[PDB]
Each structure stands twice: as structure tokens, then as C-alpha cells.
Design an enzyme around this catalytic site. Structure first.
Site, PDB file in Angstrom:
ATOM      1  N   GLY A  27       0.851  -1.178   0.000  1.00 29.05           N
ATOM      2  CA  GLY A  27       0.000   0.000   0.000  1.00 29.05           C
ATOM      3  C   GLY A  27       0.883   1.223   0.000  1.00 29.05           C
ATOM      4  N   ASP A 139       8.365 -13.394  11.657  1.00 29.11           N
ATOM      5  CA  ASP A 139       9.125 -12.544  10.695  1.00 29.11           C
ATOM      6  C   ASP A 139       9.810 -11.393  11.392  1.00 29.11           C
ATOM      7  OD1 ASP A 139      10.124 -12.034   8.120  1.00 29.11           O
ATOM      8  OD2 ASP A 139       8.311 -10.865   7.513  1.00 29.11           O
TER       9      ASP A 139
END
Length: 347
Positions: A27, A139
Site C-alpha cells: 500500500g 518474521d
């Protein structure tokens, strides 16, 4: 009906004076002014509805972030979307504005031992809460650690997070994996799906090493290369650890390699505090069953200035939820998950 160096960045009557920042996380990100709170905030526009994966990552992250409440985990302040599913093409997520992240900081700045210690403390304090909720981040890396100008640190990006599932962790040799290569624990390449808490501790060890030297400790260029970087530093696994790997294909791969001795952490990091290296060693342990857990790490002498378990809170209850849901049904759950932020009833 408001533009940011294209594109459409329409965040309604609450948020004024836009200011472009980056382009991460499928985005686009702007600084903006929160007229109700009178502070500058960060807004990410998310347009994930065209890819099932984007939708998965987005739902996962919103559900977790709305459930968690912790000083060292980024919160969601507001979510802006259209009033109906039909009109909803984008979602905007408003969060506290954070000046920088550890990835950007390490490009140009050397950290003092004090800054390393406090940043590591905050990472582990956030991780204790995450793990206490039975969630794995999966992550962790410098770019997912946000920082402000007063050295407050907040973990972000729960797009690949999962509920812990150690009973179903086992897999075959060289199983594909999605999380950032350089921070992957050795067992991911050997026999693990990364469904256990030890996967995150490895990533934290990698981050500590990187704070010590400003460079990644295990910069693999490809999937198997990652394992060989690790083995170049830790050395050949010991028999007991090799016996733990019952996966014949993974065990025989390790047996096929020439013997390598351990590279001493103080050769690698001659300027490092010796207590930091001792904790480093415990986080970067080959056998995940022997790897230090988050609460033991917090109690390590390196962190004695900060450790206080009464001020290291845990989640009020485990988290529980996946991949089977289509892009259409994902849009619907996202719509429902974001309902609490809607004006809704206005007379």
C-alpha cells in the site's frame, strides 16, 4: 477527494495535513494530523482485495493487533474504510507515528552498548507478551522494529504470525518457507514448519548480532545457502543434536558436510560486551530444544538493569483463530473486524 503524490489518500474529517513517507506493506504510508488527539499519527493505506494472500496477511494482522495491548507492540488507533462491503476498496490503518525503524537506523548509526541492551530488552519484553498469547511472530527482523526519538521500540508486521502448534511442527528436508531468509532458524531448512516459539528467539539472536556489528550475521543468498552461513559460524552440530534430527534426509545432509569448528563469538564481535555474547550464544543455539526461551532471556545478566517480571506483562488469554478461506470471504471478515471504528449511528 485528497491527493498524495500519486494517489487517492482519503482519510476523512479526522486526519489533516498529509505527508508521504514510504511504500512498504502492499500500500502506501503517510504522516498525518489527528484532530481529535492533536498529535501526528501514521496511516497506511491497504488495497489488498485483489490478492487472496494480501487479504490473509491483512486479516491476520488486524485480528492480532486489535487483540494485543502492549507498550512494545504497535497498536491500531483507528481503521478507516467505506460504510459498506460493496464500496470498500481500501482500508486505512492508523497507528502511532514512529520516526524510524531498526533497519534504517543500522544503515547509518553505530549503537552504544546501552542502546543495544535497551533495544534488546524491549524486543524480548514485546516477545514475552506475544508468546504468552500463544502467538508466533515468524518474521522478526530490523525493519519490523519501529523506533521513536526517545528510543521506544515497537514490534510490528504480524502478517505471517501464527498460533503456536509444536505437535505439527515436523516436515521434510528443504520445505519451502515464506519468512525473511536471513533471520530463519536452521531447523526451518531441516525439519521444521516454524510452528514453535524457538523460531522467534533465533530471529532475535540474529537481530542482536546485527545490532553488534551493523551487518546481518547470516546473509544467505538463497534457501540452502542460509543453512550453510549458520553452520560456518556455529560449526558442525554435536552428535546429540544430530541424533535429535530423525529426518534421514536432513540428517544425512548434515553428515555429508566437512567438519567445521565453531567461530568464537568474541572473534566475530571483539567490541561486544561479554554478557551480550553469552546471551547471543544462547539465542543462536542450533538445537531448538536447547535454545533459550523468552523469559530466560529476560532474566539473563546482560539485561539485569531492566529485568523486572512484574513489569513484563502477559496477555490476558491465548489467541485462537485460515488458508482455506477465499478472497471474497476474507473481505467480509475484514469488514466485520474493522466495524468497531465506524461512526455507525449518527443523528
Amino acid at each position: 477527494a485528497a491527493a498524495a503524490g500519486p494517489q487517492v489518500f482519503d482519510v476523512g474529517p479526522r486526519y489533516t495535513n498529509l505527508s508521504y513517507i514510504g511504500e512498504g506493506a502492499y500500500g502506501m504510508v503517510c504522516s498525518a494530523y489527528d484532530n481529535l488527539n492533536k498529535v501526528r499519527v501514521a496511516i497506511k493505506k491497504i488495497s489488498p482485495f485483489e490478492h487472496q494472500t494480501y487479504c490473509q496477511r491483512t486479516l491476520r494482522e488486524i485480528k492480532i493487533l486489535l487483540r494485543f495491548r502492549h507498550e512494545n507492540i504497535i497498536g491500531i488507533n483507528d481503521i478507516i474504510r467505506a460504510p459498506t462491503i460493496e464500496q470498500m476498496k481500501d482500508v486505512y490503518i492508523v497507528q502511532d507515528l514512529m520516526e524510524t525503524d531498526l533497519y534504517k537506523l543500522l544503515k547509518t548509526q553505530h549503537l552504544s552498548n546501552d542502546h543495544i541492551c535497551y533495544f534488546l530488552y524491549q524486543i524480548l519484553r514485546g516477545l514475552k507478551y506475544i508468546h504468552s498469547a500463544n502467538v508466533l511472530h515468524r518474521d522478526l527482523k530490523p525493519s519490523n522494529l519501529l523506533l521513536n526519538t526517545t528510543c521506544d521500540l515497537k514490534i510490528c508486521d504480524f502478517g505471517l504470525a501464527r498460533v503456536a502448534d509444536p505437535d505439527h511442527d515436523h516436515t521434510g528436508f528443504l520445505t519451502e518457507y515464506v519468512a525473511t531468509r536471513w533471520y530463519r532458524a536452521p531447523e526451518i531448512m531441516l525439519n521444521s514448519k516454524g510452528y514453535t516459539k524457538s523460531i522467534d528467539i533465533w530471529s532475535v539472536g540474529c537481530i542482536l548480532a546485527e545490532m553488534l556489528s551493523n551487518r546481518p550475521i547470516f546473509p544467505g543468498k538463497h534457501y540452502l545457502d542460509q543453512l550453510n552461513h549458520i553452520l560456518g559460524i556455529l560449526g558442525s552440530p554435536e552428535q546429540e543434536d544430530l541424533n535429535c534430527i530423525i529426518n534421514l534426509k536432513a540428517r544425512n545432509y548434515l553428515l555429508s558436510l566437512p567438519h567445521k569448528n565453531k567461530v568464537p563469538w568474541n572473534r566475530l564481535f571483539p567490541n561486544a560486551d561479554s554478557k551480550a555474547l553469552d546471551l547471543l550464544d544462547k539465542m543462536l543455539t542450533f538445537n531448538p530444544h536447547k535454545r533459550i526461551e523468552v523469559e530466560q532471556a529476560l532474566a539473563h545478566p546482560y539485561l539485569e538493569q531492566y529485568y523486572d517480571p512484574s513489569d513484563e506483562p502477559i496477555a490476558e488469554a491465548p489467541f485462537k483463530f485460515l488458508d482455506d478461506l477465499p478472497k471474497e470471504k476474507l473481505k467480509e471478515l475484514i469488514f466485520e473486524e474493522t466495524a468497531r471504528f465506524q461512526p455507525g449511528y449518527r443523528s
